[PDB]
Protein backbone atom coordinates (compact mmCIF):
# COMPACT_ATOMS: atom_id res chain seq x y z
CA UNK A 1 0.00 0.00 0.00
CA UNK A 2 2.63 2.59 1.03
CA UNK A 3 5.15 3.35 -1.71
CA UNK A 4 8.51 3.99 -0.03
CA UNK A 5 10.85 3.62 -3.03
CA UNK A 6 11.87 6.53 -5.24
CA UNK A 7 13.17 6.02 -8.78
CA UNK A 8 16.71 5.07 -7.75
CA UNK A 9 15.72 2.91 -4.77
CA UNK A 10 13.75 0.75 -7.20
CA UNK A 11 17.01 -0.09 -8.99
CA UNK A 12 18.53 -1.42 -5.74
CA UNK A 13 15.38 -3.06 -4.40
CA UNK A 14 17.07 -6.47 -4.15
CA UNK A 15 19.75 -5.18 -1.78
CA UNK A 16 17.18 -3.20 0.22
CA UNK A 17 14.88 -6.22 0.45
CA UNK A 18 17.73 -8.52 1.48
CA UNK A 19 18.59 -6.19 4.36
CA UNK A 20 14.97 -5.67 5.41
CA UNK A 21 14.35 -9.42 5.56
CA UNK A 22 17.18 -9.77 8.09
CA UNK A 23 15.58 -7.16 10.35
CA UNK A 24 12.16 -8.82 10.18
CA UNK A 25 13.70 -12.11 11.38
CA UNK A 26 15.04 -10.28 14.44
CA UNK A 27 18.66 -10.56 13.29
CA UNK A 28 19.03 -6.91 14.31
CA UNK A 29 22.83 -6.92 14.55
CA UNK A 30 23.20 -8.26 11.00
CA UNK A 31 20.50 -5.94 9.66
CA UNK A 32 22.10 -2.82 11.16
CA UNK A 33 25.42 -3.61 9.49
CA UNK A 34 23.70 -4.38 6.18
CA UNK A 35 21.87 -1.05 6.07
CA UNK A 36 24.99 0.81 7.18
CA UNK A 37 26.68 -0.84 4.20
CA UNK A 38 23.83 0.37 1.97
CA UNK A 39 24.06 3.88 3.42
CA UNK A 40 27.78 4.20 2.65
CA UNK A 41 27.25 2.81 -0.86
CA UNK A 42 24.04 4.78 -1.54
CA UNK A 43 24.33 7.84 0.74
CA UNK A 44 21.29 9.48 -0.91
CA UNK A 45 18.95 6.47 -0.63
CA UNK A 46 15.93 7.31 1.56
CA UNK A 47 14.98 3.65 1.98
CA UNK A 48 18.51 2.67 2.99
CA UNK A 49 18.50 5.43 5.61
CA UNK A 50 15.03 4.46 6.85
CA UNK A 51 16.18 0.86 7.26
CA UNK A 52 19.16 1.99 9.33
CA UNK A 53 16.76 3.97 11.52
CA UNK A 54 14.26 1.12 11.92
CA UNK A 55 17.12 -1.24 12.81
CA UNK A 56 18.44 1.20 15.41
CA UNK A 57 14.87 1.49 16.71
CA UNK A 58 14.47 -2.29 17.06
CA UNK A 59 17.93 -2.45 18.64
CA UNK A 60 16.81 -0.06 21.38
CA UNK A 61 13.89 -2.40 22.09
CA UNK A 62 16.12 -5.47 22.37
CA UNK A 63 18.77 -3.55 24.33
CA UNK A 64 16.25 -1.41 26.27
CA UNK A 65 18.66 1.51 25.76
CA UNK A 66 17.69 5.17 25.51
CA UNK A 67 20.95 6.10 23.77
CA UNK A 68 20.35 3.57 21.00
CA UNK A 69 16.89 5.04 20.46
CA UNK A 70 18.30 8.58 20.52
CA UNK A 71 20.56 7.59 17.63
CA UNK A 72 17.59 6.24 15.69
CA UNK A 73 15.84 9.59 16.25
CA UNK A 74 18.61 11.42 14.40
CA UNK A 75 18.59 8.85 11.59
CA UNK A 76 14.83 9.31 11.16
CA UNK A 77 15.62 13.00 10.75
CA UNK A 78 18.36 12.17 8.25
CA UNK A 79 15.78 10.44 6.03
CA UNK A 80 13.80 13.69 5.74
CA UNK A 81 16.93 15.65 4.77
CA UNK A 82 17.68 13.42 1.76
CA UNK A 83 16.58 14.31 -1.78
CA UNK A 84 13.53 12.94 -3.56
CA UNK A 85 12.01 11.26 -0.51
CA UNK A 86 8.62 9.63 -1.24
CA UNK A 87 5.76 11.23 0.66
CA UNK A 88 4.69 8.04 2.45
CA UNK A 89 8.26 7.38 3.61
CA UNK A 90 8.72 11.01 4.66
CA UNK A 91 5.60 10.88 6.84
CA UNK A 92 6.42 7.46 8.34
CA UNK A 93 9.95 8.56 9.22
CA UNK A 94 9.06 11.84 10.94
CA UNK A 95 5.99 10.44 12.71
CA UNK A 96 8.04 7.60 14.20
CA UNK A 97 10.62 10.23 15.19
CA UNK A 98 7.98 12.20 17.09
CA UNK A 99 6.49 9.10 18.72
CA UNK A 100 9.94 8.02 19.91
CA UNK A 101 10.76 11.55 21.09
CA UNK A 102 7.63 11.54 23.26
CA UNK A 103 8.44 8.01 24.47
CA UNK A 104 11.80 9.30 25.73
CA UNK A 105 10.21 12.40 27.27
CA UNK A 106 11.53 14.86 24.66
CA UNK A 107 8.24 16.70 24.32
CA UNK A 108 9.70 20.01 23.14
CA UNK A 109 11.58 18.23 20.36
CA UNK A 110 8.52 16.21 19.39
CA UNK A 111 6.63 19.47 18.85
CA UNK A 112 9.08 20.80 16.26
CA UNK A 113 8.79 17.53 14.34
CA UNK A 114 4.99 17.70 14.53
CA UNK A 115 4.95 21.32 13.34
CA UNK A 116 7.18 20.30 10.44
CA UNK A 117 4.88 17.37 9.63
CA UNK A 118 1.86 19.69 9.43
CA UNK A 119 3.77 22.13 7.22
CA UNK A 120 4.80 19.32 4.87
CA UNK A 121 1.31 17.76 4.81
CA UNK A 122 -1.24 20.59 5.20
CA UNK A 123 -4.29 18.45 4.31
CA UNK A 124 -3.60 15.57 6.74
CA UNK A 125 -6.11 15.98 9.57
CA UNK A 126 -4.60 13.23 11.74
CA UNK A 127 -1.27 15.08 11.86
CA UNK A 128 -2.99 18.21 13.17
CA UNK A 129 -4.63 16.11 15.88
CA UNK A 130 -1.16 14.74 16.68
CA UNK A 131 0.17 18.30 16.81
CA UNK A 132 -2.52 19.21 19.33
CA UNK A 133 -1.36 16.34 21.54
CA UNK A 134 2.17 17.68 21.20
CA UNK A 135 0.98 20.99 22.64
CA UNK A 136 -0.99 19.33 25.45
CA UNK A 137 2.09 17.41 26.60
CA UNK A 138 4.16 20.57 27.18
CA UNK A 139 1.25 22.32 28.90
CA UNK A 140 0.36 24.68 26.03
CA UNK A 141 -3.42 24.49 26.17
CA UNK A 142 -3.87 27.76 24.26
CA UNK A 143 -2.09 26.47 21.15
CA UNK A 144 -3.68 23.02 21.49
CA UNK A 145 -7.10 24.69 21.48
CA UNK A 146 -6.44 26.53 18.21
CA UNK A 147 -5.23 23.33 16.53
CA UNK A 148 -8.42 21.45 17.37
CA UNK A 149 -10.50 24.49 16.43
CA UNK A 150 -8.77 24.48 13.04
CA UNK A 151 -9.48 20.76 12.65
CA UNK A 152 -13.15 21.07 13.63
CA UNK A 153 -13.81 23.87 11.13
CA UNK A 154 -12.56 21.62 8.31
CA UNK A 155 -13.84 18.34 9.81
CA UNK A 156 -16.68 19.01 12.28
CA UNK A 157 -17.31 15.28 12.82
CA UNK A 158 -13.77 14.30 13.88
CA UNK A 159 -14.27 12.57 17.23
CA UNK A 160 -10.62 12.74 18.26
CA UNK A 161 -10.63 16.52 17.89
CA UNK A 162 -13.91 16.65 19.81
CA UNK A 163 -12.84 14.83 22.99
CA UNK A 164 -9.63 16.87 23.06
CA UNK A 165 -11.47 20.13 22.47
CA UNK A 166 -13.90 19.14 25.22
CA UNK A 167 -11.01 18.21 27.52
CA UNK A 168 -9.42 21.63 26.94
CA UNK A 169 -12.71 23.43 27.56
CA UNK A 170 -13.28 21.61 30.84
CA UNK A 171 -9.74 22.39 32.01
CA UNK A 172 -10.64 26.04 31.31
CA UNK A 173 -13.68 25.66 33.63
CA UNK A 174 -16.06 25.91 30.65
CA UNK A 175 -18.04 23.03 32.09
CA UNK A 176 -21.32 23.33 30.19
CA UNK A 177 -19.54 23.93 26.87
CA UNK A 178 -17.26 20.89 27.28
CA UNK A 179 -20.07 18.36 27.76
CA UNK A 180 -21.34 18.08 24.14
CA UNK A 181 -17.78 17.79 22.81
CA UNK A 182 -16.71 15.13 25.32
CA UNK A 183 -19.97 13.20 24.85
CA UNK A 184 -20.10 13.36 21.04
CA UNK A 185 -16.40 12.57 20.84
CA UNK A 186 -16.68 9.40 22.93
CA UNK A 187 -19.85 8.37 21.10
CA UNK A 188 -18.01 8.79 17.79
CA UNK A 189 -15.95 5.67 18.48
CA UNK A 190 -13.05 7.07 16.47
CA UNK A 191 -9.56 5.79 17.33
CA UNK A 192 -8.32 7.58 20.44
CA UNK A 193 -11.72 8.53 21.87
CA UNK A 194 -11.96 5.44 24.13
CA UNK A 195 -9.77 6.96 26.84
CA UNK A 196 -10.45 6.99 30.58
CA UNK A 197 -9.61 10.70 30.76
CA UNK A 198 -12.64 11.66 28.67
CA UNK A 199 -14.96 9.37 30.63
CA UNK A 200 -13.58 10.77 33.89
CA UNK A 201 -13.99 14.41 32.87
CA UNK A 202 -17.34 14.04 31.09
CA UNK A 203 -18.90 12.60 34.25
CA UNK A 204 -17.29 15.27 36.42
CA UNK A 205 -18.58 18.07 34.19
CA UNK A 206 -22.07 16.56 34.38
CA UNK A 207 -21.98 16.37 38.19
CA UNK A 208 -21.05 20.05 38.38
CA UNK A 209 -24.07 21.09 36.29
CA UNK A 210 -26.53 18.81 38.10
CA UNK A 211 -26.93 16.36 35.21
CA UNK A 212 -27.97 12.98 36.62
CA UNK A 213 -26.55 11.16 33.56
CA UNK A 214 -22.99 11.44 34.90
CA UNK A 215 -22.86 8.04 36.60
CA UNK A 216 -24.00 6.32 33.40
CA UNK A 217 -20.69 7.43 31.90
CA UNK A 218 -18.82 6.26 35.00
CA UNK A 219 -20.48 2.85 34.59
CA UNK A 220 -19.54 2.76 30.90
CA UNK A 221 -15.95 3.73 31.67
CA UNK A 222 -15.85 0.97 34.27
CA UNK A 223 -17.39 -1.40 31.70
CA UNK A 224 -14.59 -0.58 29.23
CA UNK A 225 -11.81 -1.16 31.76
CA UNK A 226 -10.80 2.45 32.42
CA UNK A 227 -12.07 2.58 36.02
CA UNK A 228 -11.53 -0.08 38.66
CA UNK A 229 -15.09 0.67 39.80
CA UNK A 230 -17.79 3.31 39.52
CA UNK A 231 -16.61 4.91 42.78
CA UNK A 232 -12.84 4.45 42.30
CA UNK A 233 -11.93 6.32 39.11
CA UNK A 234 -8.17 6.91 39.33
CA UNK A 235 -6.29 6.40 36.06
CA UNK A 236 -2.67 5.73 37.16
CA UNK A 237 -3.23 2.44 38.96
CA UNK A 238 -1.41 -0.70 40.05
CA UNK A 239 -4.05 -3.40 39.63
CA UNK A 240 -4.87 -5.68 42.55
CA UNK A 241 -4.28 -3.21 45.39
CA UNK A 242 -6.88 -3.52 48.14
CA UNK A 243 -9.57 -0.92 47.45
CA UNK A 244 -11.79 0.50 50.19
CA UNK A 245 -12.85 4.11 50.90
CA UNK A 246 -11.89 4.28 54.59
CA UNK A 247 -8.94 2.68 56.40
CA UNK A 248 -8.07 2.16 60.04
CA UNK A 249 -4.50 2.65 61.30
CA UNK A 250 -4.24 -1.11 61.89
CA UNK A 251 -5.38 -1.90 58.35
CA UNK A 252 -2.68 0.36 56.88
CA UNK A 253 0.08 -1.07 59.08
CA UNK A 254 1.51 2.44 59.57
CA UNK A 255 0.71 2.47 63.30
CA UNK A 256 3.98 4.14 64.30
CA UNK A 257 3.40 7.05 61.90
CA UNK A 258 -0.15 7.50 63.20
CA UNK A 259 1.02 7.37 66.82
CA UNK A 260 3.67 10.00 66.11
CA UNK A 261 1.14 12.31 64.44
CA UNK A 262 -1.42 11.98 67.22
CA UNK A 263 1.07 12.17 70.10
CA UNK A 264 2.78 15.30 68.70
CA UNK A 265 -0.26 16.91 67.07
CA UNK A 266 -0.01 20.12 69.12
CA UNK A 267 3.46 21.04 67.83
CA UNK A 268 2.27 20.30 64.29
CA UNK A 269 -0.68 22.61 64.89
CA UNK A 270 1.42 25.37 66.43
CA UNK A 271 3.95 25.50 63.59
CA UNK A 272 1.08 25.70 61.11
CA UNK A 273 -0.51 28.54 63.09
CA UNK A 274 2.83 30.37 63.24
CA UNK A 275 3.04 30.23 59.45
CA UNK A 276 -0.55 31.47 59.20
CA UNK A 277 0.28 34.44 61.43
CA UNK A 278 3.76 35.43 60.25
CA UNK A 279 4.27 33.77 56.85
CA UNK A 280 0.82 33.40 55.30
CA UNK A 281 2.25 33.63 51.78
CA UNK A 282 3.55 30.08 52.24
CA UNK A 283 -0.09 28.96 52.03
CA UNK A 284 -1.02 28.76 48.33
CA UNK A 285 -4.62 28.59 47.02
CA UNK A 286 -5.79 25.28 45.63
CA UNK A 287 -5.22 25.58 41.88
CA UNK A 288 -6.94 22.50 40.41
CA UNK A 289 -10.45 23.97 39.93
CA UNK A 290 -11.82 21.65 42.62
CA UNK A 291 -13.89 24.29 44.47
CA UNK A 292 -17.45 25.29 43.75
CA UNK A 293 -16.91 28.20 46.16
CA UNK A 294 -14.95 29.31 49.21
CA UNK A 295 -11.34 29.70 50.27
CA UNK A 296 -8.91 26.78 50.42
CA UNK A 297 -5.12 27.03 50.70
CA UNK A 298 -2.27 24.60 51.32
CA UNK A 299 1.25 24.81 52.77
CA UNK A 300 3.30 21.99 51.25
CA UNK A 301 6.35 20.45 52.94
CA UNK A 302 6.87 17.42 50.65
CA UNK A 303 5.81 16.74 47.08
CA UNK A 304 6.75 13.84 44.80
CA UNK A 305 8.98 12.54 47.58
CA UNK A 306 11.05 15.75 47.59
CA UNK A 307 11.44 17.93 50.66
CA UNK A 308 10.87 21.67 50.17
CA UNK A 309 13.77 23.13 52.14
CA UNK A 310 12.39 26.67 52.29
CA UNK A 311 8.93 25.47 53.32
CA UNK A 312 10.39 23.41 56.16
CA UNK A 313 11.89 26.60 57.63
CA UNK A 314 8.32 27.35 58.71
CA UNK A 315 7.71 23.93 60.30
CA UNK A 316 11.18 22.69 61.28
CA UNK A 317 10.13 20.41 64.15
CA UNK A 318 7.35 18.89 62.04
CA UNK A 319 9.74 18.20 59.16
CA UNK A 320 12.24 16.67 61.59
CA UNK A 321 9.49 14.48 63.07
CA UNK A 322 8.46 13.23 59.61
CA UNK A 323 12.01 12.41 58.45
CA UNK A 324 11.68 9.21 60.52
CA UNK A 325 8.93 7.82 58.24
CA UNK A 326 10.07 7.08 54.66
CA UNK A 327 6.65 5.61 53.89
CA UNK A 328 5.42 9.22 53.54
CA UNK A 329 8.54 11.30 52.83
CA UNK A 330 9.41 8.84 50.06
CA UNK A 331 5.89 8.71 48.60
CA UNK A 332 6.61 10.10 45.13
CA UNK A 333 2.85 9.93 44.38
CA UNK A 334 1.77 11.98 47.39
CA UNK A 335 2.48 15.09 49.43
CA UNK A 336 2.77 16.34 52.99
CA UNK A 337 1.02 19.63 53.61
CA UNK A 338 -1.11 21.77 55.87
CA UNK A 339 -4.57 22.49 54.47
CA UNK A 340 -6.68 25.44 55.65
CA UNK A 341 -10.32 25.78 54.60
CA UNK A 342 -12.65 28.61 55.56
CA UNK A 343 -16.45 28.81 55.91
CA UNK A 344 -18.55 28.99 52.77
CA UNK A 345 -16.40 26.41 50.97
CA UNK A 346 -17.59 23.42 48.97
CA UNK A 347 -15.20 21.11 47.13
CA UNK A 348 -16.72 19.37 44.10
CA UNK A 349 -16.86 15.57 44.17
CA UNK A 350 -13.51 14.45 42.79
CA UNK A 351 -11.04 11.59 42.57
CA UNK A 352 -7.26 11.56 42.92
CA UNK A 353 -4.97 10.46 40.10
CA UNK A 354 -3.60 7.21 41.52
CA UNK A 355 -4.63 4.25 43.66
CA UNK A 356 -1.02 3.91 44.85
CA UNK A 357 -1.42 6.16 47.91
CA UNK A 358 -3.51 6.52 51.04
CA UNK A 359 -4.36 9.87 52.60
CA UNK A 360 -3.95 10.65 56.31
CA UNK A 361 -5.77 13.68 57.74
CA UNK A 362 -4.67 14.91 61.18
CA UNK A 363 -7.08 17.38 62.77
CA UNK A 364 -5.35 20.50 64.08
CA UNK A 365 -8.07 23.18 64.38
CA UNK A 366 -11.53 21.69 63.87
CA UNK A 367 -14.62 23.84 64.57
CA UNK A 368 -17.40 22.10 66.47
CA UNK A 369 -19.79 22.01 63.51
CA UNK A 370 -19.81 22.71 59.78
CA UNK A 371 -16.86 20.59 58.57
CA UNK A 372 -17.29 17.16 57.02
CA UNK A 373 -15.79 14.94 54.33
CA UNK A 374 -17.57 12.26 52.29
CA UNK A 375 -15.66 9.41 50.66
CA UNK A 376 -17.78 7.03 48.59
CA UNK A 377 -21.17 6.91 50.39
CA UNK A 378 -19.87 7.55 53.92
CA UNK A 379 -19.45 10.97 55.55
CA UNK A 380 -17.09 11.60 58.46
CA UNK A 381 -15.70 14.50 60.48
CA UNK A 382 -12.23 15.45 61.66
CA UNK A 383 -11.13 15.58 65.29
CA UNK A 384 -8.34 17.65 66.80
CA UNK A 385 -5.39 15.35 67.44
CA UNK A 386 -6.91 12.41 65.54
CA UNK A 387 -6.05 10.86 62.18
CA UNK A 388 -8.51 9.96 59.44
CA UNK A 389 -7.37 7.67 56.61
CA UNK A 390 -9.09 7.27 53.25
CA UNK A 391 -8.28 6.23 49.68
CA UNK A 392 -8.71 9.43 47.66
CA UNK A 393 -8.88 7.42 44.43
CA UNK A 394 -12.50 6.99 45.53
CA UNK A 395 -14.83 9.90 44.86
CA UNK A 396 -14.84 12.26 47.82
CA UNK A 397 -16.41 15.59 48.71
CA UNK A 398 -15.80 18.24 51.38
CA UNK A 399 -17.86 21.03 52.95
CA UNK A 400 -16.92 23.90 55.28
CA UNK A 401 -19.95 25.62 56.85
CA UNK A 402 -18.51 26.53 60.27
CA UNK A 403 -17.93 30.04 61.65
CA UNK A 404 -14.10 29.99 61.65
CA UNK A 405 -11.19 28.34 59.88
CA UNK A 406 -10.48 24.60 59.77
CA UNK A 407 -6.84 23.48 59.70
CA UNK A 408 -5.70 19.91 59.02
CA UNK A 409 -2.39 18.18 58.28
CA UNK A 410 -2.31 15.86 55.26
CA UNK A 411 0.23 13.01 55.09
CA UNK A 412 0.28 10.71 52.06
CA UNK A 413 1.68 7.18 52.32
CA UNK A 414 2.39 4.47 49.77
CA UNK A 415 -0.38 1.92 49.51
CA UNK A 416 0.75 -0.68 52.09
CA UNK A 417 0.59 -3.60 49.64
CA UNK A 418 3.05 -1.92 47.25
CA UNK A 419 6.39 -3.71 47.23
CA UNK A 420 9.72 -1.93 47.82
CA UNK A 421 10.67 -2.33 44.15
CA UNK A 422 7.33 -0.80 43.14
CA UNK A 423 7.84 2.14 45.50
CA UNK A 424 11.23 2.81 43.90
CA UNK A 425 10.21 2.36 40.25
CA UNK A 426 6.73 3.86 39.91
CA UNK A 427 6.90 7.22 38.08
CA UNK A 428 6.21 10.21 40.29
CA UNK A 429 2.84 11.98 40.34
Amino acid sequence: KPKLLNKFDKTIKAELDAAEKLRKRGKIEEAVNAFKELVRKYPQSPRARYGKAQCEDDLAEKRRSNEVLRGAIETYQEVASLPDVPADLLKLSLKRRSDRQQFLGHMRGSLLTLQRLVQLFPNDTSLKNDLGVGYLLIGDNDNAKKVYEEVLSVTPNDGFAKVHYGFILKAQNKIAESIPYLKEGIESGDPGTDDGRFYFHLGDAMQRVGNKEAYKWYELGHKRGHFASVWQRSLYNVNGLKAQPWWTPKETGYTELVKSLERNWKLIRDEGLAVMDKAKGLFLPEDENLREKGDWSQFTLWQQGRRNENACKGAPKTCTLLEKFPETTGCRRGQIKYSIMHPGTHVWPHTGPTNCRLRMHLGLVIPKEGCKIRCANETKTWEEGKVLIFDDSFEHEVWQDASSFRLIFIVDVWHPELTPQQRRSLPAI
Binding site: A60, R64, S65, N66, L104, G105, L136, L137, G139, F167, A171, R197, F200, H201, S234, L235, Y236, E286, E288, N289, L290, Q303, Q304, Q335, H350, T351, G352, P353, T354, D392, P427, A428, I429
Partner: peptide
Protein backbone atom coordinates in the same frame (compact mmCIF):
# COMPACT_ATOMS: atom_id res chain seq x y z
CA UNK B 1 1.23 21.59 36.19
CA UNK B 2 1.02 18.56 38.48
CA UNK B 3 -1.82 16.26 39.53
CA UNK B 4 -1.93 16.64 43.32
CA UNK B 5 -5.61 16.23 44.25
CA UNK B 6 -7.23 15.71 40.84
CA UNK B 7 -6.73 14.66 37.21
CA UNK B 8 -6.82 18.07 35.54
CA UNK B 9 -3.67 17.68 33.45
CA UNK B 10 -3.62 15.78 30.17
CA UNK B 11 -0.82 13.60 31.56
CA UNK B 12 0.09 13.35 35.24
CA UNK B 13 3.38 11.47 34.77
CA UNK B 14 6.54 12.83 33.16
CA UNK B 15 8.24 9.61 32.04
CA UNK B 16 11.61 9.49 30.30
CA UNK B 17 13.15 6.34 28.84
CA UNK B 18 12.58 2.62 29.17
Amino acid sequence: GKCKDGLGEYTCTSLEGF
